[PDB]
């Protein structure tokens, strides 16, 4: 005897990956960015730049 | 203070002289109050 045409379904699930990268900055310059350690000079301006 | 001739000096070189403006202009031609005391 003959056969009937077949059917079928399916699913594929995802998977989780990630990227990351460190970006450390130091205290000596962190005091200069935020202006806390900033002094009123003509020399501290250049170090801030 | 250090500015505009001693500034670049101390920044790139590492040293800075006191009376820089005078030596630069030379190389290339370019009230009180009273107080008591015991004298």
Q: How many CB atoms lie within 10 A of CB A35?
A: 10
Q: Is residue B24 within 8 Å of residue B5, measured between CB atoms?
A: yes
Tell me the structure's resolution in angstroms, rounded to a single decimal: 4.4
Backbone angles phi, psi at A20, to 5 degrees: -170, 155
Experimental method: cryo-EM
Q: Running DSSP on this structure, what letter comes out for residue B3?
A: -
Q: Running DSSP on this structure, what letter comes out for residue B28?
A: S
The answer to whether B1 faces chain A, any CB pair under 8 Å, is yes
Structure tokens at B15: 């040293």
Structure tokens at A22: 């460190």
Nearest chain A residue to B10 by CA: give it.
A43
Q: In whole angstroms, what is the distance from residue B15 CA to residue B34 CA?
A: 40
The answer to whether B7 faces chain A, any CB pair under 8 Å, is yes
A45 Ramachandran zone, left/alpha/beta (phi>0; psi -120 to 50)? alpha
């Amino acid at each position: 005897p003959a056969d009937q045409p077949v059917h079928n379904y399916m699913i594929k699930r995802l998977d989780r990956r990630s990227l990351n990268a460190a970006f450390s900055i130091a205290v000596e310059a962190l005091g200069l960015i935020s202006g806390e350690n900033l002094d009123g000079t003509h020399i501290s301006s250049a170090m801030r730049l | 203070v250090i500015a505009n001739t001693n500034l670049v000096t101390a920044l790139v070189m590492g040293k800075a002289v006191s009376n820089m403006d005078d030596v630069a202009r030379y190389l290339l031609g370019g009230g009180s109050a009273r107080v008591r005391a015991d004298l």
